[PDB]
Amino acid sequence: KRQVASGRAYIHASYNNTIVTITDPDGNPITWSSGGVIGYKGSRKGTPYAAQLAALDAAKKAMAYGMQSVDVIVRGTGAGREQAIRALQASGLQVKSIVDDTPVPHNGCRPKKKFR
C-alpha cells in the first residue's frame, strides 16, 4: 500500500521480449510486467500484442497502488516497442512525457559475432 499516484514507467523493448516497469518518482519500482508474465512463451513473447498486454498488466497493477500521472522512458527497440506506449495511452494512466533513453556506447566494447 505504498501510496504513490505519480511516477516513472520504463519500457524495455528487445527483439525477443518486452518488459515494462512502473516506479516512484526517484526510481524505486512499484510493479512490473512482461511478455512472460502475461501468459506467453516463445518467440510469441516479443510481439506487439504481447507488448500491449504487458503494458496493460503493469498499468492495472499500478492502479492498485494508486498510480495516475506517469512519465515514460523507452529504452530499446523492437516490434511493439511503440505498441506498449499506445497501450499505456489507452490505460487511463495519464502520460505526461515520453523520452528515449536507449543507451548507446561511445564505442567501447566488442560485440558478438552476431553484431558485426
Binding site: 523507452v74 512525457s97 515520453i98 523520452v99 561511445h106
Partner: protein, 70 residues
C-alpha cells in the same frame, strides 16, 4: 530550416569557455551537428568539433541527452 552560422554575429570558433554560442551547435541530444545543419567550412567544422569536445571535458556542454516527444 535555415543554417546556424546564418543566425549569429561574429564569434570565436576557438573559445571553449563560451557556452551560450556553443549550445547552438548541438542537437536535442548531445550530438555535434552535421555540416548540413551548421553550414560551416571543413576547416570551420574541424575547429568547432575540437572546441566543443574541450568544453565537454570542462563540463559546460553535455556529452549526451534524452530525446523528448516520440
Amino acid at each position: 530550416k535555415a543554417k546556424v552560422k546564418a543566425t549569429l554575429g561574429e564569434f570565436d570558433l576557438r573559445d571553449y569557455r563560451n557556452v551560450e554560442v556553443l549550445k547552438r551547435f548541438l542537437s536535442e541530444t548531445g550530438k555535434i551537428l552535421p555540416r548540413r545543419r551548421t553550414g560551416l567550412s571543413a576547416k570551420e567544422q574541424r575547429i568547432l568539433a575540437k572546441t566543443i569536445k574541450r568544453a565537454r571535458i570542462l563540463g559546460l556542454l553535455p556529452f549526451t541527452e534524452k530525446l523528448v516527444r516520440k
